[PDB]
Ligand SMILES: CC(=O)SCCNC(=O)CCNC(=O)[C@H](O)C(C)(C)COP(=O)(O)OP(=O)(O)OC[C@H]1O[C@@H](n2cnc3c(N)ncnc32)[C@H](O)[C@@H]1OP(=O)(O)O
């Protein structure tokens with residue numbers, strides 16, 4: 001397999017370098033724009049430079065290890081024009097991937113995650129540690145599912161949706177593009193575009209756009 | 210082992226056909242009363258007919274893959290008179306079954322579930338994906354534990370109890386027959402028969418009967 | 419390896435005898451002060467006597483299998499003077515221990531627990547079943563993390579902190595010494611010393627000292 005460039009040397013990039021290693025991949029390094037991170041390492045893996053150096057590594061697979069759905073979309077749209085780069089799909093050896101699971105390029109399925117049956121993910125999704133996506137779940141592009149999220153059957157998550165840590169989503173709930181579910185929320189109603197909901201039961205906090 | 214008939218071709222039957230396959234079982238097919246499902250398949254496995262065709266398959270093990278505790282009880286009482294049929298016990302290879310675990314016929318323990326020590330389950334129980342039953346937990350017959358439920362030590366769950374996804378139950382809590390705990394509930398008090406409780410902390414919503 | 423003495427023959431000691439067995443350890447027995455437990459067993463393992471018999475077993479490793487952080491501290495300070503005894507570190511074969519994980523003596527990591535990267539634990543910590551400690555998490559001494567707790571990145575847990583079952587802690591939150599987070603709490607603010615917080619979102623209930 002090609003060596004991997006990880007975009008993002010923060011908390012998510014730290015954990016995705018670990019995922020890559022567990023997947024048997026060689027990480028060439030990170031690209032990160034943070035001034036303080038130039039010349040730095042995570043566990044023997046160098047920050048090689050800024051995102052505008054990505055054209056130096058067309059021989060590598062990429063993943064965008066940045067938790068914010070919008071930040072991944074923005075990076076793809078600016079730095080990764082269609083067909084110029086290839087993207088890894090990283091599935092932790094301890095993740096459970098069942099039957100009729102469809103996962104598009106750039107997606108990261110972390111340790112202990114469970115996707116049961118008939119689950120569809122778009123490009124550059126994240127399913128973090130110990131999260132569960134039950135039967136018939138659909139994710140759009142650039143969806144972030146945080147650790148321990150509980151995504152019940154037939155839930156639909158639009159593009160650039162974020163589901164916070166240990167939140168719970170009732171079966172058949174639809175979450176429209178750009179919405180965010182706070183950590184620990186108990187979601188029993190559909191959510192409209194760009195809405196942030198929090199609490200038990202989940203209620204509208206604010207709109208993100 | 211005998212081939213398996215799965216009663217219920219909905220969301221739970223979909224996931225239990227997957228469980229059966231993972232357990233090395235051959236699923237002969239589903240029985241389901243849904244008109245729209247006659248002549249249909251889940252992933253190469255046929256809906257063979259209606260529940261009143263169950264006497265055609267006495268050479269098979271059965272499981273009742275229907276999430277509603279009352280629906281499983283009703284099906285057993287009408288269609289499965291004592292000693293006429295045999296029932297599978299399905300334990301996912303990725304479920305953790307510890308020591309002095311007692312599980313009665315027809316029970317389904319799904320992927321990533323954990324039963325630690327001194328746990329007792331009655332007949333036709335479901336412990337769904339990533340749920341944890343800690344030391345001394347007792348389930349009656351026809352108990353449903355949804356994905357990611359957190360059932361602390363020495364909790365007692367009566368017959369036809371349902372514990373919703375990612376709910377949490379305080380140690381030593383008793384839940385009397387027929388009660389339901391909403392998804393995400395934080396249960397710190399005993400629950401009486403047929404009560405539905407929701408929220409954090411869990412409070413009485415309504416009575417189911 | 420040395421045979422193990424487990425201090426505490428209650429619910430936690432029951433589960434830690436199971437952990438020890440899974441770790442390939444031989445448990446010589448329990449020490450427990452409970453009058454009713456003298457001459458009793460858990461699953462072929464005897465209660466040998468009271469804690470003041472610990473000097474009879476300097477040839478054994480010890481673990482303090484008592485959930486209360488303060489009870490472990492009190493037992494260590496009274497019965498286990500510095501350098502007189504050795505302590506086991508027990509990590510369930512189904513726990514995931516990632517890279518640059520530092521765990522001090524007497525710590526118990528239970529079945530399905532996940533510590534990702536750059537996690538530091540002090541002495542006599544407990545990480546119970548299916549809990550997740552994400553990148554950069556730091557635990558002091560005598561920290562209890564209950565089943566299914568969701569401890570996000572860069573969270574700091576002081577000494578004698580207790581995090582209740584299936585609680586969720588927002589990234590970068592600091593919890594000062596002696597605080598307790600109720601089961602199912604959604605913690606989005608720092609917590610001060612000896613504070614008990616409950617609920618969604620977590621709010622001050624009382625002070626423990
Ligand atoms: C490995 C990893 O670490 S992956 C990362 C895992 N982390 C997550 O999933 C955390 C996701 N983040 C959240 O849930 C945040 O709490 C957010 C984004 C919803 C809101 O954060 P902020 O915009 O900083 O909101 P803030 O904390 O200032 O709170 C504003 C109000 O909303 C409430 N609130 C905010 N978040 C939540 C929540 N998750 N649940 C309940 N109430 C909440 C607050 O109580 C406050 O109410 P008030 O006006 O009555 O005081």
Ligand SMILES: CC(=O)SCCNC(=O)CCNC(=O)[C@H](O)C(C)(C)COP(=O)(O)OP(=O)(O)OC[C@H]1O[C@@H](n2cnc3c(N)ncnc32)[C@H](O)[C@@H]1OP(=O)(O)O
Pocket residue numbers: 134135151152153170171186188200201276337355356372373374390391392393394405407408414
């Ligand atoms: C693989 C799988 O998918 S397995 C399936 C996993 N799914 C589950 O576990 C979900 C279990 N279902 C639930 O928890 C449901 O929310 C139920 C059954 C408790 C209630 O559903 P309904 O009867 O449809 O109640 P409904 O949604 O109309 O809400 C009624 C009231 O209760 C409240 N409420 C309902 N459920 C909950 C909940 N889980 N938590 C908090 N509040 C709740 C609502 O906010 C509403 O309050 P209001 O009167 O102030 O508006």
Ligand SMILES: CC(=O)SCCNC(=O)CCNC(=O)[C@H](O)C(C)(C)COP(=O)(O)OP(=O)(O)OC[C@H]1O[C@@H](n2cnc3c(N)ncnc32)[C@H](O)[C@@H]1OP(=O)(O)O
Pocket residue numbers: 343344360361362379380395397409410485546564565581582583599600601602603614616617623
């Ligand atoms: C394998 C295993 O079993 S490991 C063990 C796992 N167990 C745990 O993690 C449980 C931890 N314990 C808790 O969370 C407890 O609920 C505690 C310690 C916070 C409080 O317990 P107590 O001191 O007995 O408080 P009590 O139950 O009397 O409730 C007092 C008030 O706080 C509220 N409250 C208490 N705990 C909680 C909670 N976790 N969430 C929300 N509200 C709570 C009650 O609703 C009550 O409010 P009121 O005054 O409005 O009636």
Ligand SMILES: Cc1cn([C@H]2C[C@H](O)[C@@H](COP(=O)(O)OP(=O)(O)O)O2)c(=O)[nH]c1=O
Pocket residue numbers: 008009010011012013031032033034037051065066067068071075
């Ligand atoms: C949005 C964005 C972020 N970054 C980097 C800056 C930070 O080091 C990193 C984000 O790290 P951090 O803020 O910890 O968040 P995350 O959980 O997504 O890792 O991403 C870029 O290099 N370019 C970008 O366009």
Ligand SMILES: Cc1cn([C@H]2C[C@H](O)[C@@H](COP(=O)(O)OP(=O)(O)O)O2)c(=O)[nH]c1=O
Pocket residue numbers: 217218219220221222240241242243246260274275276277280284
């Ligand atoms: C109660 C009941 C249900 N069913 C079928 C109808 C539906 O296809 C199926 C239930 O599917 P569904 O409604 O998705 O719920 P579950 O989560 O339990 O699968 O069970 C019967 O065939 N007979 C019965 O007596």
Ligand SMILES: Cc1cn([C@H]2C[C@H](O)[C@@H](COP(=O)(O)OP(=O)(O)O)O2)c(=O)[nH]c1=O
Pocket residue numbers: 426427428429430431449450451452455469483484485486489493
């Ligand atoms: C605090 C303390 C407890 N114990 C014992 C008494 C009980 O049997 C046991 C605690 O069991 P229990 O009360 O079930 O709680 P836990 O979850 O910690 O097991 O610890 C001692 O023997 N000495 C002590 O100093």
Ligand code: NA
Pocket residue numbers: 112130321339530548
């Ligand atoms: Na798990």
Ligand code: NA
Pocket residue numbers: 148166357375566584
């Ligand atoms: Na959870």
